[model samples]
Target: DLADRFAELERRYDARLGVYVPATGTTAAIEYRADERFAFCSTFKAPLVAAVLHQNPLTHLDKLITYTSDDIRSISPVAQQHVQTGMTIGQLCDAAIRYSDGTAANLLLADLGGPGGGTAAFTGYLRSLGDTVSRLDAEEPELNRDPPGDERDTTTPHAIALVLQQLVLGNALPPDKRALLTDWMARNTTGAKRIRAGFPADWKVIDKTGTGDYGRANDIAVVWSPTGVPYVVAVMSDRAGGGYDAEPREALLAEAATCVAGVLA
Candidate 1:
């Protein structure tokens, strides 16, 4: 019945949908196309910053990185304002996760070693976390070039949901680092119109959202029941016709979140 509900939602929206909500002590996991691949888009920024925390000392986050105007990328709301002043590694993570700042993401990727090494290092980090279905082949801008059939810079719903679970609720990162990551996600400025829009006023939610070419829109979140149990939900969607839509299907994603809320409630 749950699967059919998601199937009908896909039909109603004329899009392909992938969702994964991990099991809790009292409820079974709900999955629909959970293993299916979709372009990661900006959603990768969350894990990218998480990897930064995983590889470095907590003190490493406070070290600043200076850059010129040339390093700034399009859509960097937070980084562009501080161009000359630069940002600390922790600030960059904040920009990447809370603001989806491309410059901040690219900077952190370079901090990990750039195309040749950053890509591999990030993939390796995912591997260490028991994720074999996600990959980051390029940095920002180019990575958002999410062609329908291409696997580069892509992840399965289940893989990313699991990573979020580990980061937010599991032991993948140190407690302090994990709290920082969770706080950033909880306050994410980019997701209010997406998953966050669908929850009941009292339900606690922490999320990351992504948008890409070909109508790809995604929101991954940790939703806590009123009783304090946490569930991880990942909702990824793309249009079927293969043409890029400048606008994302925000309503569809929100509706998907609403559906999950009902099931969990």
Candidate 2:
């Protein structure tokens, strides 16, 4: 029944949609194309920041870092302001997670290692979390180049949903770091038009969203119901005619979220 509903939505939008809503105590997940690959987009930043927090002591977040004008990318609205004064590691995480700031993400990635080493290192972090399907192949603009059938910088809905579950609800990070990541995700400004649109006002959600070339729009989230239980949702989609000029179909993602919420509710 859930498969039929998702198929209907896919046909209506003429897009490929992959979703994974993990099971809860009372309801089964409404899954479709859960194992299919889709461009990760800026969603990788969330995990990137998390890894930065994971690899070091909490005191490390207090350390300040600076970058030159050359470090700024085309989309560094938040990072650009702090270029003169620099920012603490915690501040960088906030910028990256809340605004999906590419410059902030690149900075954190470099903290994990150098730029050339960060992708593989981040991939290794994901591997440690039992995620074999998700990866980061490059930094910023290059990672967003989501060509058709490309696996680099792509993730399966199932793989990333589990990854989110582990990060947010599992023991992958210490309590303080987990709470920090969750707080940043909860305060995200970019997702109001996406998965958040599908839920009722009373529900709580923490999410990281991704947008890329070829009409890619994705959101991976943790939703808490009134029953005091949490469920994970990952939605990734791409359109045939979608590209830089064409914006993602946020309404479709909202509709898909509606399907999951209705089933869970």
Candidate 3:
């Protein structure tokens, strides 16, 4: 089973990861560690974008939104060039998801009333969907405050998997808008070496990547089998200040993906 394979991978790597694959109308999910919650890092962008798209649409995404010098901060690599005169909300969403831009995330947080603003309403929207266990409370700077147990955002493997299921398979957003969101992730450059490394080069995988303090790596994705079926996969991990021979947890995540893919295959 995939669960056993996941456990074996974790054991070999000395790492922990959470993943969820919706079983397509079945009561239980095809996954393990589905309920385990951890610091979500950039993987939070998945639901954040979904929340906005739920309220807004492709029209809202393509409209212009401004940024400023104050928005200048670390961890936002892709948003630098586009926010010059200000880009569309859709563009910011692309930066946040495809590139894991911190500034873009902060801007979206402001729009969602996150952090210092009306946080309850933002979380309330998420809770309403029964996709529990995350709080988009930190802006980009907060990502640096990685003390033990520090959590900018929290989510379980199962919680986030459910989110992907809704967005991809449920009516979370309209079809065209959903495709737009997934398209950005499909073009993602960041997560290529993470879970994607586990698959053959020709496979189709759309993903969002996140990194936090203490070397935590997180990625949530929609993966397709060779035969054209799809599944949701979330891999969350943390491994910092490693030994001299420490292995990259990314390889373990790849192994995790292979386990699921091998089963689905």
Candidate 4:
């Protein structure tokens, strides 16, 4: 079974070499020459969102937070726009996580005390949850500098999978908090067709996509099977083509996830 799975992954990698990790049992079940270090890009926002919800609760979602016009820009060039004043925290969070809005995310990052604050808070939160390998690159300004290469964020396949496991099991936060996070992830607006392309039509996937111009792409997702079993799959790719479509990338991940699901089923 392992050889067949690895062979399938190798064929996929030959067409498009990248990092893929499927995690089970609190460790990486499979890793495709996966890297221990890579850039975080916008995916960092997911954990940031989780941290904020964990700290503030849903009641604080509507609290107003100040933001500048530049602070409200969307991460996608296709979605950029000016900021409007008196926006509620909930709106910002939704925009950031659901829409992958750079403006909303940066604004929250600033409020959470900037990247430093986000990093510190997130790492502390992970530690509290016993997920020590996961760390925020945003904490160190030196890591986020221009030329992007100098400051790449890092994560093991197992760590990201653990995050998904926690969220699914309602272990990342209190029951209520987990529900909110899961709801937000289900609404995440990136690579829906791509990352989830090969799954059974009835299967539901809550996922996030991270991409950068300097050849960086990633998809972290929770796959819910028809029988109610859930699997966490995280794929990080570097130097791949396909622009934003990411179909080829998605194929690799989706196949691996299907294999894992078949076993669990």
Candidate 5:
């Protein structure tokens, strides 16, 4: 079903793609090339935020962190607003997720220990969840700019989707922290035009989007059906080539999510 559609899409676009939506409460799933790997882009923020909050209590969420003039660098499309402002950890966090702020993400990365510390902690956490990584750079100002001359952080729809499942299924992150992450994602506005558009409005949807070098448009989401069931939906594209080619890629995601809605229903 999905595999055939994905195959047809790939042929039409000269791209490789992946989609994963697990059966509610079980390992069974509906996937097409779910094992295919693509740059995680900003999708890593999902686990990055979890690791940052994992080491701190909920009260620490409001702790203030400052943004300086130097933090303003090229490639930041969403983090410009916080320049020279005293933003709380929670605010930068919501900005990072809700707005997909690269600078905001690097700030959290620094909090997690920067190059060595945050990278290690994030990778270790991902490993504990049974996922491997390919790249981690917290200093960059723009993820979509200067396409990764080298391999960037990578993941498969199955792995990313499974992580989302674990977050909601419990034990991946503590219940409270999980709730917080889920809520932040639900409030996400960066992805409003992606899966959020194709998904049923009445149903609750929490999602994260990542834009990487070379036309990669990715999104991972926890879509709660009207019946109150939340299923993980992750779609990643490795060949959209980042431009006007991007719109149809997004539309493809919406179309794909639309296909998934029926299965989840």
Candidate 6:
């Protein structure tokens, strides 16, 4: 089983790890300590986008949401670069998912009623779907005093895998919504170069990367082989000494992932 393989890999690399719960039917796997709470960076946007879609099912695909300088200011540089006037809600969702656009995510977060409101709504929806581990940062009422900085916004490997499971089962959103989510994920900014480096060049991996100043670096992704076997994996860690240089960190992680995937395959 991949679980045993992952455990062995963890020991070999001195890397903490976790694997997907196989019952989910989709490739929704997660890595251990992979769950240690850390800053969300852009990863939080995935759920936030899901929350928005859940809240506004009737929202027009082509409806444009206006952005002011203040709104743009709260968004990340990547998101700012992607935003243009007259983009639709669907388009913004694409930006948020595919590019990890902080601007598009923040706008949706605001529209869903700020962090608290959006998080609450998302949690409520998750609970309704029977997902107990998943929690949204937007739901913390005391978030103002202890916001999701580099130290906060924790999640468990189990929780992340479960969330992916729900999305796979069509429990998180409608079929159309799931399609969009997976499609965007397939086109995620973080490619298979890292964490996915071990697979053959043609193997398809959908992933997201999360990084911040407190030595935080992470990747969550779905790995699929040509045979159509799928699995979810997540790697989250905080390094003490080095500054953030995405390429090397990603390469190391990808190497580890490749080793694990080889065993599983």
Top candidate by lDDT: 1
Estimate the TM-score of every prediction.
Answer: 0.96, 0.96, 0.86, 0.77, 0.86, 0.75
Sorted by TM-score (best first), the order is: 1, 2, 3, 5, 4, 6
The reply for model 4, stretches above 4 Å from the true place, is: 1-28, 33-35, 72-82, 114-117, 139-151, 240-251, 255-265
- Once fitted onto the true fold, the runs of candidate 3 whose alpha carbons sit more than 4 angstroms away are 1-4, 25-28, 114-119, 143-152, 240-248
lDDT of 1 at 77: 93
lDDT by candidate, in order shown: 0.88, 0.87, 0.72, 0.60, 0.73, 0.58
Which portions of model 2 show Cα errors greater than 4 Å?
114-117
Give the range of the ten consecutive residues with the poorest summed lDDT in model 2. 239-248
Q: Residue 133 in candidate 1 has what lDDT?
A: 89
Worst 10 residues of 6 by lDDT: 139-148
Candidate 5 lDDT at 106 equals 76
Tens digit of per-residue lDDT, candidate 3, span 78-174: 6677666887788788888888887877777667764465345556667877866766565676653455354446777788777877887678888
- Misplaced by over 4 Å in model 5 are 25-27, 74-78, 114-117, 133-150, 240-248
Score candidate 2 by TM-score against the native: 0.96
RMSD of each: 1.3, 1.4, 3.1, 4.4, 2.9, 4.8
Residue-wise lDDT of candidate 6 within 54-79, one digit each (tens)? 77764555677776655564435455
Candidate 2 residue pairs that clash = none
lDDT of 4 by residue, 1-265 (tens): 5536646664655433233445556444655545455555566667767777777858888888765544434453212433345567777677766777666666566556634645666667667766676666553222222243343355555566666667666567788777766788888877565457656767788877666543455677777778666677676655434343333344555565565555545
lDDT accuracy of residue 53 in candidate 1: 93
- Give Cα distance to truth, residue 227, candidate 6, Å: 0.7
* Residue 76 miss distance in model 3 (angstroms): 1.6
